[PDB]
Write a protein that binds this ligand. Structure first.
Ligand SMILES: Cc1cc2nc3c(=O)[nH]c(=O)nc-3n(C[C@H](O)[C@H](O)[C@H](O)COP(=O)(O)O)c2cc1C
Ligand SMILES: Cc1cc2nc3c(=O)[nH]c(=O)nc-3n(C[C@H](O)[C@H](O)[C@H](O)COP(=O)(O)O)c2cc1C
Ligand SMILES: O=C(O)[C@@H]1CC=CC2=Nc3ccccc3N[C@H]21
Lengths: 203, 202
């Protein structure tokens, strides 16, 4: 299909919960053959307010938010511990859609972290265990050699404590869909206690 | 070809990270990357809540990345309040990311004019009609107003709220995917006066 004028009937009649709409949009993105729809630009900040960002491919979406895995000792992991707030942005060129998810990243339980680790491959385990994500790389060949050593053992590799999941639980979401006449469709959800309030925005 | 892109600068980094940004953008163009300038721009309000949206940046100069927006938009208010921004490029076709973090500095009025002047007639009409991010009261009315402005059939002046910023990098990261999962990560940071580079673990 085209990158303007996607159908968006929910603009005028929004579901009560934004996660419902998020899942709908993601499912349509798959029908539309969007390339890497789950590539989320995740922004976090340090205590002085300085913002950093990187792509995360999220794992799944449950009824409460967007689940992803990372190293708790990485830059994003340290920032999340410091300040809690995060924002994630999806953008699909093929359909002219963006989704902003702003919330807090809630650490998952250890049992959930284990299940996430078990869902990955042994090569992923080996590089994840060998690398302290975002720390200075001193010796690239040594790192590569250690990941190869771990793989060759053929033993189950334990989950390093830094490998953890978070749930990004939104307090605000925006759904944006391009229009060819430039009056883009913008639907904002904001938490309102146990409910949500929606607004349409000017482009 | 989304893995193991050529990256000699990983081991031999240019003195200025903008140099490498421009090199990568030129290669993205050769590789026919779709919308390579679509930056995920994050900002924050003073209480710490972060927000994000796509911005197609306008240009790059030796001091940073230039973009435009409405000063009264949600991002505009946040930029005024805290100054901090982080922009992220991601090119699926080549397995490359670039992170640009720093202060967004307002441009001068002459630079604002130039940015406005550079845009199209249809862009001007809707940008003049719409108060970006304010509540939309009546869709039909805003459409009609944009069309009326367009119909004036002359060059519309720059609305005062239409402004540019220069994102001046304090730190930049270049990431290139590797088929062996040991992704190439090159970080530049300002350490006092000049740039410190490091390679990072993936
Ligand atoms: C498509 C794509 C998906 C990625 N998914 C993840 C992920 O799920 N978890 C993760 O820790 N890093 C992921 N990364 C790597 C991050 O972009 C980043 O390099 C890393 O998490 C370190 O970020 P930090 O130094 O800002 O903490 C992904 C990168 C790309 C390009
Ligand atoms: C591809 C693309 C390019 C965009 N370029 C800009 C831009 O250069 N400036 C701008 O104000 N909004 C741009 N937008 C719209 C923003 O993503 C956003 O909807 C608008 O700026 C309001 O953001 P805010 O409410 O967070 O302030 C672009 C959107 C898309 C999808
Ligand atoms: O989509 C993927 O597997 C991601 C691609 C690139 C880097 C990644 N790094 C990770 C580090 C920790 C946990 C998950 C990751 N995902 C991949």
């Amino acid at each position: 299909t085209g990158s303007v004028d996607v159908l968006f009937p929910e603009y005028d009649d929004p579901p009560s919960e934004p996660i419902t709409l998020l899942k709908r949009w993601l499912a349509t993105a798959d029908v539309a053959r969007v390339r890497e729809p789950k590539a989320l630009a995740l922004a976090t900040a340090t205590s002085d307010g300085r913002i950093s960002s990187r792509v995360i491919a999220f794992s799944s979406i449950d009824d409460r938010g967007v689940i992803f895995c990372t190293h708790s000792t990485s830059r994003k992991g340290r920032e999340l511990t410091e300040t809690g707030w995060a924002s994630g942005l999806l953008y699909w060129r093929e359909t002219g859609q963006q989704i902003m998810i702003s919330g807090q990243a809630v650490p998952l339980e250890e049992s959930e972290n284990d299940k996430l680790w078990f869902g990955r491959s042994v090569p992923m385990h080996a590089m994840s265990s060998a690398s302290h994500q975002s720390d200075e790389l001193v010796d690239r060949e040594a790192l590569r050699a250690h990941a190869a050593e771990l793989l060759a053992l053929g033993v189950a590799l334990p989950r390093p404590p830094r490998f953890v999941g978070y749930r990004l639980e939104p307090h605000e979401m925006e759904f944006w869909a391009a229009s060819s006449d430039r009056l883009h469709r913008r639907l904002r959800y904001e938490r309102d206690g146990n409910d949500w309030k929606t607004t349409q925005l000017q482009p």
